Structure formats: structure tokens, C-alpha cells
Ligand binder design. Structure first.
Ligand SMILES: CCOC(=O)[C@H](CCCNC(=N)N)NC(=O)c1ccccc1
Ligand SMILES: N=C(N)NCCC[C@@H](NC(=O)c1ccccc1)C(=O)O
Ligand SMILES: NC(=[NH2+])NCCC[C@H](N)C(=O)O
Ligand SMILES: [Ca+2]
Ligand SMILES: [Cl-]
Ligand SMILES: [Cl-]
Ligand SMILES: [Cl-]
Length: 223
């Protein structure tokens, strides 16, 4: 996250970390057993870390649970990043508390102009590399499908939306992928892609979760 702020410890209770010996992606807890992340975050033997603030220090609110299933969208395209969504089933159910909770799925697509909260342990620098210990937070509005397509001609599918600032200065970045975009109390986005971070006319591009609600519910029911 570039141009964000320190969330505060366990102030994003749905924010998880996907660890393969190290943090490489975010994810969103949507119920006791299931996480939504980005398809491009797929890898074998994922450990899910919940109740994290400082991802490099044990603070005592963590739950560490192995992924038993990692299910990439059937039409995920690694080149276009179309359908950049994955479901992870937890080997056991997370314990509900003030610090570890699910975020609700959308019932509708949110409107351009709606404010969203974007969170993660990704790069905080648009030039060079700095990884924060503690979770960073950004407030960023959904941008018009029109200004998104203007920024990324020939690249924005109906499964993608832009959020942020056409002037740049605030964005998601490398290591935020799979993390939540939460608008009007609902999970509307997954951190997917962008050209650089926080650059002018180059806002973050997010998986449009409202298109996947029926696939998510069917996957959960079957598995
Ligand atoms: C695991 C690393 O992936 C990520 O977190 C990022 C997220 C990008 C956010 N960028 C914004 N401008 N908001 N994804 C990639 O890397 C990417 C690749 C190639 C091209 C673009 C992104
Ligand atoms: N399908 C199940 N077997 N579930 C058991 C729930 C146990 C546990 N978890 C939550 O209720 C929870 C829900 C959302 C987010 C985090 C936890 C509890 O009893 O604490
Ligand atoms: N527009 C915002 N995102 N405001 C929140 C920034 C952080 C908050 N003002 C604080 O003192 O910790
Ligand atoms: Ca920790
Ligand atoms: Cl709708
Ligand atoms: Cl629009
Ligand atoms: Cl176009």
C-alpha cells in the first residue's frame, strides 16, 4: 500500500496473509472456513495467517491454519489476469473474536464514487522496495468503468474495476495481491494488477467480486 496509514492492530479482522515460508499475498476471510484471494497467488501447501498485525513478530492474536483446498477460477487467464480469483478452504474453522472475523460478500455491484478500504503488507514505495511490519490501510474510491478503460485501453474486462486516484499518490502495490477491497461493508474487490503503483492515470485494477458470488456459494456448498 502506497500513501496509506497504519490500520491499527486487528482493525481489519477479515485480512489474512498467505505464507509459503514467507508472506507473498493477502486474502479475505468470508466465513469460518473459506478465504478469497487472487488466482495469481496460487501455490501448493499455503499456510493461512489470521489475527496478524506485525507479520514478522508473534503478538498473540494470530491463528495459523493450513489450506486443505485451493480452487482457482476455471477461466483464470495468467496473461490477461481475467477471473483473478481463488477460494482457499481452511483445514479447520477459524475461531471468531473481535480480531478474527469474516467480511460479507456483495449482494450487488457497488457504484463508482463509493469509498472502499484497501489493506495489505505490500510495498509502500512506488520507487524501490519497502515492506511494512504492520498492516497498512488505504481509503480509495471506485472509479468509473469509463476512466478505468481510458487508463488501461484494451485491458479492462467486465470482471475488473479500478479504484484510487487518477492523480496517483495512493494505491495498492506488489505483495497486496489477493487482499481485500471492502466498500459499504461488502467485499467488492481483490487486489489483482496495475501498471506500477500510485502513478498518474494508472490506478489499481481489482477483481470484480460481485460477478463471482454464485460461483463462490456453489464452490463452498460442493467442498
Ligand atoms: C504477488 C505480487 O503481486 C501483487 O501483489 C501485484 C499487485 C499490483 C497492484 N498494483 C497497483 N497499481 N495497484 N500484482 C502484480 O505483481 C502485477 C504483475 C504484473 C503487472 C501488474 C501487477
Ligand atoms: N462451519 C463450522 N463448523 N463452523 C464452526 C464455527 C466455529 C468458530 N467460528 C466462527 O463462527 C467464525 C465465523 C466467521 C469468522 C471466524 C469465525 C467459533 O465458534 O468461533
Ligand atoms: N482519510 C483517511 N483515510 N483517514 C484516516 C487516516 C488515519 C487516521 N486519520 C489516524 O489518525 O490514524
Ligand atoms: Ca504477527
Ligand atoms: Cl448489480
Ligand atoms: Cl461506472
Ligand atoms: Cl477498450
Amino acid at each position: 500500500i502506497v500513501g496509506g496509514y497504519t490500520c491499527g492492530a486487528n482493525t481489519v479482522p477479515y485480512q489474512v496473509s498467505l505464507n509459503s515460508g514467507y508472506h507473498f499475498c493477502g486474502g479475505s476471510l468470508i466465513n469460518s472456513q473459506w478465504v478469497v484471494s487472487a488466482a495469481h497467488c496460487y501455490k501448493s501447501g499455503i499456510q493461512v495467517r489470521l489475527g496478524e498485525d506485525n507479520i514478522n513478530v508473534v503478538e498473540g492474536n494470530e491463528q495459523f491454519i493450513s489450506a486443505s483446498k485451493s480452487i482457482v477460477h476455471p477461466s483464470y487467464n495468467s496473461n490477461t489476469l481475467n477471473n483473478d480469483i481463488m477460494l482457499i478452504k481452511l483445514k479447520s474453522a477459524a475461531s471468531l473474536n473481535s480480531r478474527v472475523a469474516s467480511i460479507s460478500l456483495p449482494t450487488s455491484c457497488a457504484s463508482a464514487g463509493t469509498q472502499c478500504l484497501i489493506s495489505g503488507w505490500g510495498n509502500t514505495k512506488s520507487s524501490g522496495t519497502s515492506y511494512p511490519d504492520v498492516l497498512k490501510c488505504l481509503k480509495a474510491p471506485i472509479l468509473s468503468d469509463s476512466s478505468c478503460k481510458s487508463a488501461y485501453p484494451g485491458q479492462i474486462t467486465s470482471n475488473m474495476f479500478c479504484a484510487g486516484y487518477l492523480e496517483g499518490g495512493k494505491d495498492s502495490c506488489q505483495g497486496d495481491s489477493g487482499g481485500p477491497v471492502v466498500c459499504s461493508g461488502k467485499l467488492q474487490g481483490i487486489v489483482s494488477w496495475g501498471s506500477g503503483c500510485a502513478q498518474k492515470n494508472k490506478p489499481g485494477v481489482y477483481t470484480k467480486v460481485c460477478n463471482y458470488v454464485s460461483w463462490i456459494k456453489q464452490t463452498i456448498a460442493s467442498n
